[PDB]
RNA sequence: CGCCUCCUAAAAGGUAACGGAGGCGCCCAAAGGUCCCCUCAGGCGGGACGGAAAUCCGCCGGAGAGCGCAAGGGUAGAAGGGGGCCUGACUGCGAGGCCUGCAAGCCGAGCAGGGGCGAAAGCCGGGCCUAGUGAACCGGUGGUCCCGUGUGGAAGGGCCA
RNA sequence: AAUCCCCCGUGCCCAUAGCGGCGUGGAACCACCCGUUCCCAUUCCGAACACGGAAGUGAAACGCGCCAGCGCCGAUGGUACUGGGCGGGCGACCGCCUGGGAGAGUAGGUCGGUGCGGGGGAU
């Protein structure tokens, strides 16, 4: 555990200067590093309120620190254009290091893990070189067992990077955490 | 744009309406910091706080409290006798709480 | 008569001040505050139906 | 006519001058001493032209079915909310740039207009492109 | 057939019409105080349960989203979005003005007692404002403790709320 | 002490103080920066705010200068309008005399000018 902690620490610390000058030649800047990572998941309407809301709890929890209560369908998805406020903001905006043992554990230690979990995804982030890819099925047992039949699945996170333009960002998490195929 | 700039222009305009005659403009950060006194944009500006006469960049929000109390008396007499308040890029607990107490003695005079 | 009914404040037997008010949401709950001419200001209380 | 999906019920009345002039193809019909002109009458001309022109190569446009004219009642005595919507049309008054093409190549177009408007409803004149026009 | 808003009042203001249009005769116990923070819709690009439209990431933007309620004014230099603590949505009152012939209705610095939001420079005598309104009589109730038809009291009654 | 100059602030002027394009500075500014027990802080993270300091860099916020593409400014003329007096027409309406006389429309215009405190920049 703190094992893979020291791990990401190194992966990146070195890889960084590595490609850093390999191609950069700017001034070893965020050319192209990664900072803070928010994570978001399958909106409250995915609710049952008490039940799967508390499950969202368990999960958000053991995953990175924060676990769901009972309120996930207000101003309701209702019928099509039928919705009011937005009291279903269930996400983790944790900011740094924790995040890195995470890049670790998460990408590099749980990446392929369950049903054909391959990863042959085109322009992963591409929306400015900052993230993109959230997976559509939990890291199954990134911990816990049957603590809810359907429990959870709509999973998707995002990193705040500086890997500016893509090709660059690409160098970045490509060698840093694995670039899923063509 | 309008965002952070406003953080600014807001403490601004409110501060401004405020009117008990003068305001000192503290300024957060290390060597950055320094506070100058002003009144009505008559055009004038009383005295200048602390020329970077470093006393302890250390764990010294006290580098602060000091430069402050300093400016406190500095103006205190610098400009004979008066009463008002000031700006602040933030709440009064750190750097700024500091310039505060500085001023604080500035007026307290004991 | 609607969820809008009129009450008024009176204070610890030492005065009564007035003002209308409502019925809706927290209904009865009626302490409040106010100050009578009793003493110089004073709690008052409010309630009084 | 066409003054579809309006927005209000009625206008009012006045008249005096405006801003029609240019060219837009070189087959032009310009009003001169009018006011409002029935969206219909209008279509009239439209027809006249369209038909004359060996019945095909398109003409263009000009004014619009603009306002809602009301004779209100039907013939009553007067005091209705002045309500009633009824005849819709153009509001062109100082010799206006009325623009109609086709590819007549000639006094043929001429005729087309000739009747169209001779018809329509006023003292008016016609021509082509006479002093270009420069915009930004 | 009372009131608010817009047009026509034609540029001060201000005016009919069986002239155009269109709302209100609620409340909001906390949209009432103040201190501290924040800051739109929508466009685009990238994304779990999506999947025209949530939720999150990445840019873009005289602010056209917003403010119970209609319009209009305003206006995110927020009146707007969030947190803390609290009653002044105080009594005594006001100088001096808006409009108005009547009565109306309406604007208010500042002095007093008295508190509440900051440490304070100060804001708070309801709300973001322009409609939610009704003389006079009559009578009720909570006072008060002024009057009483010889005097003591009292039916009853004067001013307050 | 009291000259201009570099500025860090902090003031009047509402877009020629804008967008954006090329450049460029840290010596000293100042920014990001380091880390967090301690002030005090994020309904998640000191992200911001904050505390706690050598460094490293000047990427990022950042200040001038060149660039007018968008945007902003937007005259001279010129017409419409019309204050007032008179005509011409049954007419809707036209026209004449005497002062005021925007708009848009080529000009061409700009990539701020400056109030004050001051580290200080040049015996």
């Amino acid at each position: 555990m703190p094992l893979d902690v020291a791990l990401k620490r190194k992966y990146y610390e070195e890889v960084r200067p590595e490609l850093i000058r390999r191609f950069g030649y700017q001034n070893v800047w965020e050319v192209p590093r990664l900072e803070k990572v928010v994570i978001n998941q399958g909106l409250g309407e995915a609710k049952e309120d008490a039940r799967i809301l508390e499950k969202a709890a368990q999960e958000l929890a053991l995953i990175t620190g924060q676990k769901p209560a009972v309120t996930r369908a207000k101003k309701s998805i209702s019928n099509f254009k039928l919705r009011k406020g937005m009291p279903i903001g269930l996400r983790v905006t944790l900011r740094r290091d924790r995040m890195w043992i995470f890049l670790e554990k998460l990408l590099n230690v749980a990446l392929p893990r369950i049903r054909d979990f391959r990863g042959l995804n085109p322009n992963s982030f591409d929306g400015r070189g900052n993230y993109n890819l959230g997976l559509r099925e939990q890291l199954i047992f990134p911990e816990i067992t049957y603590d809810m039949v359907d429990a959870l699945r709509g999973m998707d996170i995002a990193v705040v990077t500086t890997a500016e333009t893509d090709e660059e960002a690409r160098a970045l998490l490509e060698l840093l955490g694995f670039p899923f195929r063509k | 744009r309008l965002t952070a700039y406003e953080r600014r222009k807001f403490r601004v305009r409110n501060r401004i309406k405020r009117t008990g005659r003068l305001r000192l403009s503290v300024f957060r950060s290390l060597k950055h910091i320094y506070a100058q006194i002003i009144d009505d944009e008559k055009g004038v500006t009383l005295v200048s706080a602390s020329s970077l006469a470093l006393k302890l960049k250390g764990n010294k929000t006290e580098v602060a409290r000091q430069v402050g109390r300093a400016l406190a008396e500095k103006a205190l007499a610098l400009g004979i006798k008066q009463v008002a308040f000031d700006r602040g890029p933030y709440k009064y607990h750190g750097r700024v709480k500091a310039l505060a107490e500085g001023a604080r003695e500035g007026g307290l005079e004991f | 008569r609607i969820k809008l009914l009129l009450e008024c404040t009176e204070c610890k037997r030492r005065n009564y001040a007035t003002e209308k008010n409502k019925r809706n949401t927290p209904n009865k709950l009626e302490l409040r505050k106010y100050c009578p001419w009793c003493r110089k200001h004073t709690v008052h209380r409010e309630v009084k139906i | 006519r066409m003054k579809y999906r309006k927005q209000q019920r009625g206008r009012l009345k006045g008249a005096t001058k405006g801003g029609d002039y240019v060219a837009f193809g070189d087959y032009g019909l310009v009003a001169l001493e009018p006011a409002w002109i029935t969206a219909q009458q209008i279509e009239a001309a439209r027809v006249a032209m369209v038909r004359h022109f060996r019945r095909g190569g398109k003409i263009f446009i000009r004014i619009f079915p603009d306002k809602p004219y009301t004779k209100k009642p039907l013939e009553v005595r007067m005091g209705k909310g002045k309500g009633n919507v009824e005849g819709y049309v153009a509001v062109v008054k100082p010799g206006r740039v009325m623009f109609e093409v086709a590819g007549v190549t000639e006094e043929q177009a001429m005729e087309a207009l000739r009747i169209a408007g001779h018809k329509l409803p006023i003292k008016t004149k016609i021509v082509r492109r006479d002093a270009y026009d420069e915009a930004q």
Side-chain angles (χ1 to χ4, degrees), chain D:
Chain D
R1 139 286 158 181
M2 268 312 112
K3 47 130 60 181
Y4 51 108
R5 308 134 55 193
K6 196 175 302 181
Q7 200 300 140
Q8 297 285 278
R9 322 292 146 52
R11 325 310 160 81
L12 290 102
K13 6 198 170 189
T16 203
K17 157 59 211 145
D20 298 38
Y21 33 70
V22 51
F24 203 129
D26 297 0
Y27 321 51
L29 337 167
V30 68
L32 290 179
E33 284 64 8
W36 335 252
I37 183 293
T38 136
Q40 282 52 293
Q41 183 170 209
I42 293 174
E43 0 280 344
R46 78 67 37 60
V47 173
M49 317 307 280
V50 185
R51 66 83 211 169
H52 186 188
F53 299 114
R54 61 93 187 184
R55 323 91 228 185
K58 234 313 152 204
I59 0 181
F60 259 7
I61 303 92
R62 40 189 47 196
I63 216 55
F64 201 75
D66 326 316
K67 315 200 298 173
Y69 313 29
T70 307
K71 47 70 186 176
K72 295 68 181 184
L74 351 156
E75 46 29 280
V76 195
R77 140 188 290 188
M78 48 341 96
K80 151 72 181 186
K82 161 192 187 61
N84 301 200
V85 308
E86 35 293 279
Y88 318 77
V89 345
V91 177
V92 262
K93 297 104 302 185
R96 299 311 210 44
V97 75
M98 285 307 110
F99 331 67
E100 267 41 68
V101 59
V104 96
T105 288
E106 275 310 319
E107 21 63 60
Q108 299 149 45
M110 277 276 275
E111 277 286 48
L113 1 159
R114 295 206 31 173
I115 303 175
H118 158 63
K119 293 275 296 60
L120 314 188
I122 15 54
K123 322 179 193 62
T124 50
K125 203 235 50 181
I126 279 167
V127 288
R128 77 326 292 196
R129 162 57 205 54
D130 36 294
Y132 252 84
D133 300 340
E134 235 280 42
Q136 52 175 294

Side-chain angles (χ1 to χ4, degrees), chain B residues 49-86:
Chain B
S50 65
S51 65
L52 195 77
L54 287 321
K55 132 287 168 187
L56 176 50
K57 289 55 63 176
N59 283 268
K60 287 310 188 178
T61 307
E62 196 43 61
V63 308
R65 168 59 177 310
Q66 284 223 307
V67 151
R69 312 175 42 204
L71 308 3
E73 332 178 310
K74 123 255 168 62
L76 137 277
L78 227 303
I80 48 190
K81 286 187 163 292
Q82 292 96 36
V83 289
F85 182 51
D86 108 312

Side-chain angles (χ1 to χ4, degrees), chain A residues 109-127:
Chain A
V109 345
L111 202 49
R113 198 193 167 197
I114 183 45
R115 287 192 156 58
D116 290 14
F117 253 34
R118 67 203 60 278
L120 329 199
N121 68 263
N123 63 296
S124 182
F125 186 58
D126 144 59

Side-chain angles (χ1 to χ4, degrees), chain A residues 77-105:
Chain A
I77 94 107
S78 320
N79 46 299
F80 186 84
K81 194 227 299 189
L82 286 259
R83 289 100 167 192
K84 331 170 175 183
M86 279 154 147
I88 287 169
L90 179 283
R91 48 73 102 309
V92 145
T93 303
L94 286 33
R95 200 79 43 163
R96 38 171 48 277
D97 322 74
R98 303 192 272 181
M99 296 282 101
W100 279 275
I101 189 282
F102 236 104
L103 173 9
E104 165 62 296
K105 190 181 173 184

